[PDB]
Symmetry: C3
Amino acid sequence: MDFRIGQGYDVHQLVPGRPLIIGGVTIPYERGLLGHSDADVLLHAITDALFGAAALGDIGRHFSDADSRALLRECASRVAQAGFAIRNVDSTIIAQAPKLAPHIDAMRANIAADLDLPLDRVNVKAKTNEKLGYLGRGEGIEAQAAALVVR
Amino acid sequence: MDFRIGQGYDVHQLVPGRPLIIGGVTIPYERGLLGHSDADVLLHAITDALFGAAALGDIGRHFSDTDPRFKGADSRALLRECASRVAQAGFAIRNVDSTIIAQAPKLAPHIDAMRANIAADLDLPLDRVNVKAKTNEKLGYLGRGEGIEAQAAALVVR
Amino acid sequence: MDFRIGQGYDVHQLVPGRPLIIGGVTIPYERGLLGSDADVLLHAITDALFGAAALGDIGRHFSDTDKGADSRALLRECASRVAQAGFAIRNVDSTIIAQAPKLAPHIDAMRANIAADLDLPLDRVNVKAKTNEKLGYLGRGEGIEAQAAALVVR
Ligand SMILES: OCc1cn2ccsc2n1
Ligand SMILES: OCc1cn2ccsc2n1
Ligand SMILES: OCc1cn2ccsc2n1
Ligand SMILES: Nc1ccnc(=O)[nH]1
Ligand SMILES: Nc1ccnc(=O)[nH]1
Ligand SMILES: Nc1ccnc(=O)[nH]1
Ligand SMILES: [Zn+2]
Ligand SMILES: [Zn+2]
Ligand SMILES: [Zn+2]
């Protein structure tokens, strides 16, 4: 019936002395993402896609720059409050390193639990940047997301 | 229930001596976006998402940067023509979402006005239109303030 | 009804010595993409189809070991796995970002290839072309990016 689509984008720098947390998963690595929160680039992109589908603005407006899962849960709350139900989420992480493949199902599990969705409605994809640009040089990590909701 | 989705992308350089026009809003700034038309990166991205959802090709095709009739073209006029062609193809627009990526200036004070322009041009209520603002966290040409990028998504139904 | 959306991204470097193949179409150029055929557009569309189906990604379905298959063979196999998970493809839209060469003359051919491979009416497949306005590695002609979106229904 009243379907809406949303899209999200995020990028953070990789810096020494920070933990690397993506999709709620702490991944062993010598650098981590820099941000005012835990800098979970994946969760932020999904969050923006959800706000965007519900026409509620953006993550910058809702949570002025701690735990990104808490923010994702709050986002899901605001989406429900606006009268929408989430139908599915898809996403991509662009990181030259480290290897993300072993952690993906954990990420999906986290996101599914945070959005109160079954696993089959949550997806997370991994890509390198084929050594191009700042992502290619491992200076940051990007995430992209898409969300479908219904009123 | 014949739904279709589309996506769009655009980027333009930020240069001295040009109006900064994003989402139809003239924003006070010392630089502006360089292009053949008014170079409204956000409206272009949305226009491409709508043409894309309707499988009508793209804005480069409909409103060519090689055709002199679009020199300094009002991108809201282009967006309204896109919406007309989308309607004529048989599609109704259900919603639009978008992102602008810029180091500067601060876009937040202008976002609501952008949403209102897009809503007006697409004949949608405000609650079916969204615009989001992002920095690029200081990375790359966007982080260096060399250009501004926009992304869009649209849902339509035949 | 049970609609789902998916999105996809891909980028390959652009250097002398390889054919330029985008959307199944070989395009005369002084350079080409590095990868198989390195078909950036087919890869992104393949990723958006798997993501709409919540089946992971092209890296997981089609790794470097398992044959030699070109990117259209992968798109078709992608499409068959999507169907067995219960989903029908409703449409695909995409954008190729390349500073050069001119892609517009080749779009009809890419759409035809994609629609054939996905068994879709032509009017549910779209491909768009963008430059990067001379910004970044894309704008210096050091690589080509593709973006895709797909809608499916169970
Ligand atoms: O652009 C990086 C970024 C800023 N911000 C504010 C809330 S979540 C988030 N990610
Ligand atoms: O890539 C910048 C660009 C080209 N073009 C043609 C019509 S609107 C527009 N934006
Ligand atoms: O990053 C370029 C790339 C990697 N990969 C794996 C399967 S298809 C494909 N394209
Ligand atoms: N960093 C990564 C990129 C792509 N695939 C992975 O598994 N990891
Ligand atoms: N350029 C901007 C990025 C993020 N937020 C803003 O308000 N403006
Ligand atoms: N490389 C290209 C970018 C934009 N339009 C084209 O036709 N080709
Ligand atoms: Zn973030
Ligand atoms: Zn433009
Ligand atoms: Zn590829």
